[PDB]
Amino acid sequence: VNRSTALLKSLSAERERWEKTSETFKNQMSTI
Questions:
Q1: N6-acetyllysine modification sites?
Q2: Torsion angle of C-alpha atoms 4, 5, 6, 8, degrees rounded to 10
């Protein structure tokens, strides 16, 4: 089950990318 585990952890890192993007993006949503 380590193949799906590797897929899951890579997806979790890519989702970390998503939440950092959402943070900065609510930032300009605030300053608009």
A1: 9
A2: 90
